[PDB]
Design a protein around this ligand. Structure first.
Ligand SMILES: C[C@@H](O)[C@H](NC(=O)OP(=O)(O)OC[C@H]1O[C@@H](n2cnc3c(N)ncnc32)[C@H](O)[C@@H]1O)C(=O)O
Ligand SMILES: [Mg+2]
Length: 330
């Protein structure tokens, strides 16, 4: 694999071209976006897209998102787009919001898992936009992690996972938000399929009527304590019997000094917690602990997405009264 260091805010166009030539030749390129890194191929090339599933060991029926760099490309991959959706797409893109739309005949089965629909977004990241531009094709990509690991948000995550399994990794620094794009299905009348950095507060203003067995990393047991009023007591109860790690904001670090901590960022800046979330799950599994205990965060703004990912990551081990602890541990 060629690892290519490219400045994420002012990318060297000659370096972007090296990766774009790989895309056009049917090869795979991992690249940063504003959400998480993606592992991409030419969205029109179904054999090239199968290489993404081979690199990740991804089940073949989990479909990809097509990333576009302009509106001409939208109409190559999607059709029958309602006028209201088109007008909204023109004000939200580039940005961390993916639309599920009806596909065109040009989109391969490998991209859509055989579905009649295709998920599309225009990524708000200079490296991603310039890669797609220079490639001259939309780029299909899911998150760039190996199957059972958390979505990658910095180059080293992608390197550890995919080095030797993909043609190019673009080392483009840390992604901006750290959690995957919001996904809305606008082929039905519309449903929020995945919360993300494009918040439900903003969505509801644009789409008033919006409707709201996989194992998720980490492999270490992880409990999510939604009720902050019992957190100290859940930690007391469990740290007596287990070697624990606490996933907490920096404001609670002093209260638990002596226990292993993974600091997610500041309670006064949820974007920091979202930026650090998946890497805190990688750290948990590097440590040698019986279990992770994460505290909840407000479900406002990107909080909703943080908590969506945290619930999944915990296998829905949610603690709202301390007696809930019974259900998940001796
Ligand atoms: C690279 C960056 O753009 C990142 N992509 C990513 O994280 O994709 P990822 O979540 O691994 O895979 C694409 C997901 O997008 C959803 N998806 C794709 N096509 C769909 C369709 N036609 N209907 C419903 N959901 C779809 C599925 O949940 C599928 O698992 C992101 O969305 O921010
Ligand atoms: Mg993924």
């Amino acid at each position: 694999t060629q690892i290519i260091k490219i400045d994420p805010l002012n990318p060297e166009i000659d370096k972007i071209k090296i990766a774009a030539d790989v895309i056009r030749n049917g090869g795979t390129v991992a690249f940063p976006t504003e959400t998480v890194y993606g592992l991409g191929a030419n969205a029109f090339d179904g054999n090239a897209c199968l290489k993404i599933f081979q690199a990740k060991n991804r089940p073949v029926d989990n479909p990809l998102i097509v990333h576009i760099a302009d509106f001409n490309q939208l109409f190559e991959v999607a059709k029958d787009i309602p006028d209201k959706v088109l007008e909204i797409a023109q004000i939200v893109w580039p940005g961390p919001l993916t639309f599920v739309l009806k596909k065109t005949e040009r989109v391969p089965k490998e991209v859509t898992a055989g579905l009649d629909t295709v998920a599309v977004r225009m990524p708000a990241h200079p490296i991603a936009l310039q890669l797609i531009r220079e490639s001259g094709v939309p780029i299909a990509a899911p998150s760039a992690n190996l199957a059972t690991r958390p979505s990658p948000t910095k180059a080293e995550d992608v390197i550890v996972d995919l080095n030797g399994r993909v043609d190019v990794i673009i080392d483009g620094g840390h992604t901006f938000f750290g959690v995957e794009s919001t996904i809305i299905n606008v082929t039905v009348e519309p449903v929020l399929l995945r919360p993300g950095p494009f918040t439900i507060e903003e969505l509801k203003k644009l789409f008033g009527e919006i409707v709201i067995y996989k194992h998720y990393a980490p492999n270490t047991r992880l409990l999510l304590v939604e009720n902050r009023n019992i957190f100290k007591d859940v930690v007391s109860l469990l740290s007596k019997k287990y070697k624990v790690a606490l996933l907490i904001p920096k404001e609670l670090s002093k209260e638990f000094e002596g226990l292993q901590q993974i600091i997610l960022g500041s309670d006064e800046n949820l974007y920091e917690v979202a930026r650090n979330l998946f890497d805190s799950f990688r750290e948990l599994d590097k440590l040698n602990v019986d279990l992770g205990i994460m505290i909840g965060f407000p479900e406002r703004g990107i909080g909703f997405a943080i908590m969506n990912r945290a619930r999944k990551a915990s296998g829905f081990s949610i603690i709202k009264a301390i007696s809930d602890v019974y259900k998940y541990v001796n």
